[PDB]
């Protein structure tokens, strides 16, 4: 046969893969965490978006920290041999390196570790995408006028906000990040490589959104998503 290039992930397996969406809206009173109004819009937007990308979507709502860990562990034990990739979307409260279950914290590292190259062999060499809509701290952006492979390889963490910053969510339209991500995937998934789609998501969030709050401290704030890529190849959702 002719010259062959290995610069893009093989996305023509019988199945695209699983898309696990963990949607935490209601938290136990004991935690003191507020309800995340608008997150259901995000969950629905994501379900439709990934359905059109041919992913086997599994929506999970209001999971405890124990349920999140159990779910991810079970999913990592499945046979992903016929799947091209794996996607996990986390919608909840959070801190740097932490995502909140309805009853408490879950170390993000604990979740992702289940899918490490040496722990989930059927996903070795395949893109493992983690889309995270959650705060990464308490800072506000005021803006400005106008042989072997690493076990950590092939992971992509699409964070909604910069490290150490709050992440914004509109109670009616959903989070700024998820709204933008779904819109860009809808328009460009059959045309652009994933990093280029995420770059347009960064531009959309950075330019089209600004907070409105009755509290001056939280008013007129901005947000820039953070793409963290350990991917080793170009990722196109389409093939042929």
């Amino acid at each position: 046969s002719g010259i062959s290039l290995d610069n893009s992930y093989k996305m023509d397996y019988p199945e695209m893969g699983l898309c696990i969406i963990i949607n935490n809206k209601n938290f136990h009173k004991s935690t003191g965490m507020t309800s995340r109004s608008g997150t259901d819009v995000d969950a629905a937007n994501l379900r439709e978006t990934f359905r059109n990308l041919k992913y086997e979507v599994r929506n999970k709502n209001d999971l405890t920290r124990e349920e999140i860990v159990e779910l991810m562990r079970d999913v990592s034990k499945e046979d992903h041999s016929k799947r091209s990739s794996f996607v996990c979307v986390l919608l909840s409260h959070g801190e740097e390196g932490i995502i909140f279950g309805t009853n408490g914290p879950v170390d993000l590292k604990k979740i992702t570790n289940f899918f490490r190259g040496d722990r989930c062999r059927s996903l070795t060499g395949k893109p493992k995408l983690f889309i995270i809509q959650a705060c990464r701290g308490t800072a506000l952006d005021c803006g400005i006028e106008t042989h072997k492979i690493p076990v950590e390889a092939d992971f992509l963490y699409a964070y909604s906000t910069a490290p150490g910053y709050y992440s914004w969510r509109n109670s009616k339209d959903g989070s700024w990040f998820i709204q933008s991500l779904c819109a860009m995937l809808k328009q460009y998934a059959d045309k652009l490589e994933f990093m280029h789609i995420l770059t347009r998501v960064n531009r959309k969030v950075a330019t089209e959104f600004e907070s409105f709050s009755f509290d001056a401290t939280f008013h007129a704030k901005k947000q820039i998503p953070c793409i963290v890529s350990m991917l080793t190849k170009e990722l196109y959702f389409y093939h042929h």
Binding site: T34, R36, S37, G38, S92, H93, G94, Q133, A134, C135, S160, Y166, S167, W168, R169, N170, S171, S175, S211, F212, S213, F218
Partner: peptide, 4 residues
């Protein structure tokens, strides 16, 4: 608008 609310924070997460």
């Amino acid at each position: 608008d609310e924070v997460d």
